[PDB]
Amino acid sequence: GAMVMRLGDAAELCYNLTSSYLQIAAESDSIIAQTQRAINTTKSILINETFPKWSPLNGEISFSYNGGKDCQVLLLLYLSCLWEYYIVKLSLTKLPTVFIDHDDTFKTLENFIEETSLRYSLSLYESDRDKCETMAEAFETFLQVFPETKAIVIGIRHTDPFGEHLKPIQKTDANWPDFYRLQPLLHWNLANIWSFLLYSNEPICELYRYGFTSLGNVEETLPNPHLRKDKNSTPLKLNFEWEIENRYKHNEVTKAEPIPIADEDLVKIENLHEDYYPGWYLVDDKLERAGRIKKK
């Protein structure tokens, strides 16, 4: 449209695309069916266990966001649940959001966080990228600025490093500033993330198109070697042709347009002299972090 969506437009959009996904007739042994189950579990955590305890309206909840596929899927679900909770169940101009910036963050990701903060009406606190501090330390500063904060939404999954023992709702550790971690994406597998994200028709970080499946820092992170194209390997098959073809249609209000990667990231991807399937050709969680510079 001629104007960016208001938060109410964004939340309603997320509710409608999520309801739509949930309406797909899928076989019980399918990725989509599993993803529908994952959504319903997420919803229940937000609507039944989170929102009755902490207000998503008054700053008590902040949303941790760094433009990655997982926090992005979680954001869409969170926005969906806000609309469901207040409009549909009858139980704010911007969403309180926190991003801890670093000096080695991908430029494409920086641009994506900028672009989506506008699209999703995020009220984004951004830590100083040029300060040398731990995440804990950045979050302690954040909490001094917003001492109303009781809880923070995080898009961590069980398959992530240190994810095994995590719970949907739990306090931070002794060495962190004191708040509840709200972790409603824990049960999501990689195939579910891709399925829902491609069906959503939301713009996603362009690094994924170029074979990245995990976004660490600019030095350490490579396109996934399991996605490298070659003439003598069995070619990879796409699990998400339907979701792409049938992705959630937009109108004038909800219309989005595509962005190429940052120029400097394209350069590093050309320098490689290898080509890759996009990230959504990887559905094996064990291999999600395969694309990393060898160390030690």
Ligand X SMILES: Nc1ncnc2c1ncn2[C@@H]1O[C@H](COP(=O)(O)CP(=O)(O)OP(=O)(O)O)[C@@H](O)[C@H]1O
Q: What track of x and - describes contact with ligand FMN for positions 101 through 140 (by CB under 6 A)?
A: ---------------------------------xxx--x-
Under rule CB under 6 A, residue 76 binds ligand X: no
Contact 195, 208 (CB under 8 A): no
Q: Which of 5, 50, 68, 211 binds ligand X (CB under 6 A)?
A: 68
Under rule CB under 6 A, residue 154 binds ligand FMN: yes
**Shortest gap between Cβ of 61 and ligand FMN (angstroms)?**
11
Contact 63, 123 (CB under 8 A): no
Which of ligand X, ligand FMN, Mg ion, none has residue 71 at its interface (CB below 5 to 8 Å by kind)?
A: ligand X
Stretch that binds ligand X, among 19-27, 152-160, 162-170, 243-251 (CB under 6 A): 152-160
Site size for Mg ion (CB under 5 A): 1
Compute the distance between CA of residue 258 and CA of residue 235 in angstroms, rounded to an integer: 27
**Shortest gap between Cβ of 151 and ligand X (angstroms)?**
13
β-pairing verdict for 122-126 and 151-153: unpaired
Under rule CB under 6 A, residue 64 binds ligand X: yes
Under rule CB under 6 A, residue 180 binds ligand X: no
Residue type, 18: T
**Shortest gap between Cβ of 189 and ligand FMN (angstroms)?**
20
Contact 180, 166 (CB under 8 A): no
Under rule CB under 6 A, residue 45 binds ligand FMN: no
Under rule CB under 6 A, residue 106 binds ligand X: no
Q: What track of x and - describes contact with ligand FMN for positions 159 through 178 (by CB under 6 A)?
A: ---x---------xx--x--
Q: What track of x and - describes contact with Mg ion for positions 49 through 78 (by CB under 5 A)?
A: ---------------------x--------
Q: Which residue of this chain has its Cβ atom nearest to ligand X in the complex?
A: 68
The candidate with the shortest Cα–Cα distance to 254, out of 73, 66, 15, 90, is 15
Site size for ligand X (CB under 6 A): 15
The candidate with the shortest Cα–Cα distance to 75, out of 211, 182, 164, is 182
Residues 50-69 that bind ligand FMN (CB under 6 A): 64
Chain residues that interact with Mg ion, rule: CB under 5 A? 70
Chain residues that interact with ligand FMN, rule: CB under 6 A? 64, 134-136, 139, 152, 154, 162, 172-173, 176, 181
